[PDB]
Design a protein around this ligand. Structure first.
Ligand SMILES: NC(=O)c1ccc[n+]([C@@H]2O[C@H](COP(=O)([O-])OP(=O)(O)OC[C@H]3O[C@@H](n4cnc5c(N)ncnc54)[C@H](O)[C@@H]3O)[C@@H](O)[C@H]2O)c1
Ligand SMILES: NC(=O)c1ccc[n+]([C@@H]2O[C@H](COP(=O)([O-])OP(=O)(O)OC[C@H]3O[C@@H](n4cnc5c(N)ncnc54)[C@H](O)[C@@H]3O)[C@@H](O)[C@H]2O)c1
Ligand SMILES: O=C(O)c1cccc(C(=O)O)n1
Ligand SMILES: O=C(O)c1cccc(C(=O)O)n1
Ligand SMILES: O=C(O)c1cccc(C(=O)O)n1
Ligand SMILES: O=C(O)c1cccc(C(=O)O)n1
Ligand SMILES: O=C(O)c1cccc(C(=O)O)n1
Ligand SMILES: O=C(O)c1cccc(C(=O)O)n1
Ligand SMILES: [Eu+2]
Ligand SMILES: [Eu+2]
Lengths: 418, 409
């Protein structure tokens, strides 16, 4: 009957709004007072079209109340962030999840369900959540239910995505699985995949890992192809004609998300068993410097120091500068003497970011494309008129419009310039 | 028209037979006299089902002649081996390809086509083959045509695949591509992908690389999952529900093949190192199963890399068998219906008679539907399936795979 959502960001706030929309009494919990003040003043703390309207209905119905403190509840959902650890492997930091678990503990009653929606390293539910709960007068699958249901939201379609997506319900016990289904049954029309907590954890991280290792492969191949005057993009397209070959696209590096590596067991106790993952991460981490070295060479062959960075985010059409290879390049270029850097991103609202394109491209020798923003797809020679040299090095292969005055380069043909 | 095929193995001999079957005058060239004597006596030097029959027709028609020496021809196809160098990568050795090229050079005439079917590192056609030919006065795309046409056939289906498989025609010039198409149009019904030589070389290296790195990922994940008491197979099936996630299947290793790089490539190297470590990982797991049980006898099921194929070359399954054979305190016995050898035991029942563990290393069709009746002679009815091939559910036999071996310990 009552649900507490701990963490009111991109995951937690729409989720709280969703259960409250279906008649559940929801208490939204966040440690950020600025967030709580915004919410208590009737405004959503996140940027999502149409959500403000839904929030207004739900706030007025008295179904969604907010606080900096948890309170007694039937269901608790942890949707706090899992920052990236300062380590090679890029392990998920479970510290905010454990801090959030400790806020919930004094309010725990028999029959309660704890759902962890945040990204967690494999064996977190079993080896970290379970011992803490069992330390209190509790038995998992009997007194309380422990579910890991990984939450992943599609921006622009968050609420629809929350209803129609297939969902993984990872219970510690078979009883926990049933408790998880009970919770989501409220609005989830999508399929509910039943499994244990460790399988749910491992699976989501394996998705991230397949993607990282494959991007590392593409990036490593780009370096090889550039050395041999081979077009990497044409060869990936060629090789992918094999039904079981799916080579990924290269880029300026990898950001956001964390991998299938627990900080302890497979780093501190058996690291040679995560050798491929480590190598993949090393290759992806080296791409900002590879882009910078390529930039330095373009700027050497041309008159000028001005490089205009286009995009400071990892994903396109997102305002997230957090753990961004595009920002890493900008900062390296800024640090670098003999290079005058100017960032352009329509999605990024920072002070230092140039808001106008024409002003940003003004007297620049090179336009550096580091994000695949929709705006960058349809760019004509008209946009680059103010440049000292009309040259583009696109690390994302986003520009789909052909030019004449402007010299356009990919990872596929950058070797032609040098 | 006349064609010379240099190197008469699994690639060259069927290719020789194929062009001659279509009316081309073919000279098969091989440096091995034993091979030439076998061929000249009327017998194929290679093991492939109905090939002997097609060889007999073609030899009698006078369309396929063999020799240890090349002779003047319109087309030359190099199908010699590219052995593994030593080398931390076990990179492709281009030496036999270059030697084959050197043996053809004195016979070269204006208008000739040189096709390299052998595995070659990117830029071989452009930086190694082209300079040698141009040194003779020949102009590529004008008086000599240079093509890389990587050949890849499935044993048992060799002649069928030569016709029906799609083909990459990698010409040094656009004229070279046209010359390559005229050669293969003789019998190729499959699609002919037109591209330049460097794209054909790189594309072949990228296919094997995507495959190896991904198998390495699956195998590395299996080691991680086993350490955390997580089922790897269930997790791959779970994760692969994502439309852009295609995690491969783990196994006992990969059928060894040279890396077509010129002797950073750090990821590629690591991937091959992980796959090479799988035979020892399987052996270490086997040693632990045999420790917990009474007995020394382990029955290997499958000695081939590919299921339902005579794939014993650089086979990980075969490598495990020999490691188990070498290992004292372990009595190994191999069972494979597809492989005929001096050590391949009496048809199943006698191979299991007092064994404490059945180790499945190949995904043969026969291994899918398997009753308890088959293992009725074993000292301990236990199965460790490194391929996840057994689909027939059974009682009294303890079935283990990569996903649950941590349960036995
Ligand atoms: N956004 C996604 O679709 C996405 C995708 C995959 C995984 N995830 C997982 O979910 C996590 C959170 O995602 P998000 O985008 O909503 O992050 P977010 O930063 O937008 O929101 C997190 C919120 O939780 C609050 N918070 C932090 N610690 C707290 C605590 N101890 N108690 C109560 N509130 C606390 C923060 O103040 C912030 O408002 C991610 O870090 C990841 O683990 C998110
Ligand atoms: N078998 C395949 O489908 C496969 C797959 C991918 C690539 N390849 C490439 O093709 C190569 C050959 O494959 P294979 O399986 O036919 O090898 P193979 O060993 O079966 O046949 C090679 C034959 O060439 C002969 N030979 C060696 N050097 C020669 C020379 N200098 N002049 C004339 N003849 C010579 C050898 O005596 C041998 O008979 C491989 O090493 C690899 O480069 C083969
Ligand atoms: O299935 C996906 O890849 C996915 C799903 C939701 C959000 C995102 C994302 O934000 O990248 N990605
Ligand atoms: O969590 C994700 O969004 C994810 C994981 C692997 C691949 C992809 C993808 O291709 O979008 N996305
Ligand atoms: O459409 C998507 O789901 C998407 C697109 C780009 C990146 C990702 C990702 O990283 O998950 N996901
Ligand atoms: O497309 C493939 O994977 C393939 C094609 C032909 C032969 C072989 C083989 O012999 O392994 N593999
Ligand atoms: O050479 C091959 O047989 C090959 C190369 C890449 C992928 C695959 C495959 O998925 O079978 N096979
Ligand atoms: O049927 C095939 O092509 C096949 C089967 C198993 C392995 C491979 C491979 O490694 O290419 N290819
Ligand atoms: Eu995605
Ligand atoms: Eu294959």
């Amino acid at each position: 009957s009552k649900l507490t959502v701990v963490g009111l960001g991109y995951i937690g706030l729409p989720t709280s709004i969703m259960f409250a929309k279906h008649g559940v009494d929801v208490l939204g919990v966040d440690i950020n007072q600025q967030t709580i003040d915004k919410l208590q003043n009737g405004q959503i703390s996140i940027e999502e079209p149409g959500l403000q309207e839904v929030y207004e209905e739900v706030l007025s119905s008295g179904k969604l109340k907010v606080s900096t403190t948890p309170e007694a509840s039937d269901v608790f959902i942890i949707a706090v962030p899992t920052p990236n650890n300062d380590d090679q492997y890029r392990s998920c930091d479970i510290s905010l999840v454990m801090r959030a678990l400790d806020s919930i503990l004094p309010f725990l009653k028999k029959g309660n369900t704890i759902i962890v929606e945040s990204t967690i390293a494999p064996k977190t539910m079993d080896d970290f959540v379970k011992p803490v709960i069992e330390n209190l007068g509790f038995t998992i699958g009997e007194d309380i239910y422990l579910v890991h249901c990984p939450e992943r939201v599609l921006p622009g379609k968050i609420l629809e995505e929350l209803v129609h997506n297939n969902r993984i319900i990872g219970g510690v016990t078979k009883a926990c699985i049933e408790a998880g289904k009970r919770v989501y049954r409220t609005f989830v029309q999508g399929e509910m995949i039943e499994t244990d907590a460790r399988t749910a954890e491992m699976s989501k991280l394996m998705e991230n890992t397949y993607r990282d290792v494959n991007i590392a492969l593409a990036n490593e191949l780009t370096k090889i192809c550039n050395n041999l005057n081979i077009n990497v993009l044409d060869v990936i397209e060629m090789a992918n004609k094999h039904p079981r070959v799916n080579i990924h696209q290269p880029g300026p590096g990898v950001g956001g998300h964390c991998l299938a590596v627990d900080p302890y067991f497979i780093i501190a106790k058996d690291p040679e068993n995560a050798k491929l993952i480590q190598t993949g991460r090393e290759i992806n981490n080296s791409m900002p410097a590879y882009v910078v070295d390529t930039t330095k060479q373009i700027i050497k062959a041309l008159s000028g120091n001005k490089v205009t960075v286009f995009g400071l985010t990892y994903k396109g059409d997102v305002d997230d500068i957090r753990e961004s290879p595009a920002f890493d390049i900008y900062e390296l270029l800024n640090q670098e003497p003999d290079i005058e850097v100017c960032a352009y991103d329509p999605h990024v609202e920072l002070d230092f970011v140039e808001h106008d394109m024409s002003h940003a491209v003004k007297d620049a020798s090179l336009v550096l494309i580091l994000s695949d923003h929709s705006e960058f797809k349809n760019l004509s020679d008209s946009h680059f008129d103010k440049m000292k040299h009309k040259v583009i090095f696109d690390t994302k292969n986003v520009v789909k419009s052909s030019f004449e005055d402007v010299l356009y380069y990919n990872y596929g043909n950058i070797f032609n310039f040098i």
